[PDB]
Amino acid sequence: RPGGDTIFGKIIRKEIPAKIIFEDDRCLAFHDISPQAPTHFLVIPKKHISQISVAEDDDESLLGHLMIVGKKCAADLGLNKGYRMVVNEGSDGGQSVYHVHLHVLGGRQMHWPPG
Amino acid sequence: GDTIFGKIIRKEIPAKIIFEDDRCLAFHDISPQAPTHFLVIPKKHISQISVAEDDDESLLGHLMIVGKKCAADLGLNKGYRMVVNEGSDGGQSVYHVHLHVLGGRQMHWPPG
Numbered sequence: 001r002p003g004g005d006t007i008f009g010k011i012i013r014k015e016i017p018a019k020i021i022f023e024d025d026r027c028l029a030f031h032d033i034s035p036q037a038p039t040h041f042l043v044i045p046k047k048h049i050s051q052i053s054v055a056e057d058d059d060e061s062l063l064g065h066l067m068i069v070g071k072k073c074a075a076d077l078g079l080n081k082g083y084r085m086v087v088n089e090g091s092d093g094g095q096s097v098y099h100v101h102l103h104v105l106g107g108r109q110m111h112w113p114p115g
Numbered sequence: 116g117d118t119i120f121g122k123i124i125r126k127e128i129p130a131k132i133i134f135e136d137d138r139c140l141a142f143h144d145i146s147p148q149a150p151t152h153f154l155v156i157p158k159k160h161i162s163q164i165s166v167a168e169d170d171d172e173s174l175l176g177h178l179m180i181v182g183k184k185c186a187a188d189l190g191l192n193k194g195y196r197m198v199v200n201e202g203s204d205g206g207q208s209v210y211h212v213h214l215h216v217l218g219g220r221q222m223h224w225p226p227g
């Protein structure tokens with residue numbers, strides 16, 4: 001099945017519900033079920049890539065598309081004071097779902113360091 | 116408006132450069148928040164991710180591919196975290212788009 005069978009692949013295929021913000025042929029933006037900020041959503045490719053460390057050179061445009069969609073959705077959600085985008089890789093990065101995803105967090109002051 | 120990152124791109128002040136090509140520069144952060152903490156920045160002066168244009172898509176993805184390749188070269192085989200800050204709530208420190216890459220320790224949740 002296209003997108004794989006991680007939770008995110010299931011969400012892509014509408015097999016598990018999610019609160020969807022934006023969708024096109026390349027990606028899907030939807031709210032995180034365990035938000036860490038007043039607004040916290042995810043932007044994921046529909047193509048299954050397990051983690052950023054194995055992304056191909058030819059995935060550049062797709063990965064950049066995640067960030068463009070991320071910043072457009074943030075504007076559409078009224079995050080006028082800004083926001084933080086996060087990609088987690090592997091264990092030290094805190095990755096728990098092995099389908100590439102961009103976190104977008106806003107609606108509060110984010111602190112430094114970023115975890 | 117020029118920034119300190121523009122001076123670093125122009126080699127006017129020193130930085131510990133990891134990698135460079137015709138469109139981006141990777142270098143260690145001067146105030147590292149992890150045992151390995153570097154930045155990947157485009158040479159094009161995009162002030163902040165919120166003003167990036169659609170035609171910048173592949174350039175932004177290039178920052179992430181360069182970042183993941185540099186992370187591997189720096190031996191971050193247990194993982195790492197990539198961060199882009201926007202605006203005051205995002206804690207953006209320099210108004211030149213930059214991708215943070217942090218590893219060498221457990222990164223925690225929430226990410227700030």
Ligand SMILES: Nc1nc2c(ncn2[C@@H]2O[C@H](COC(=O)NCCc3ccccc3)[C@@H](O)[C@H]2O)c(=O)[nH]1
Pocket residue numbers: 007016018019030031032033034035088094095096097224
């Ligand atoms: N909408 C939605 N979101 C989901 C779902 N299942 C997971 N997520 C989110 O995916 C994200 C995956 O993030 C990371 O892999 N690492 C973050 C640390 C982290 C690690 C572990 C847990 C929560 C958070 C998390 O924010 C989850 O809350 C779901 O069914 N629906």
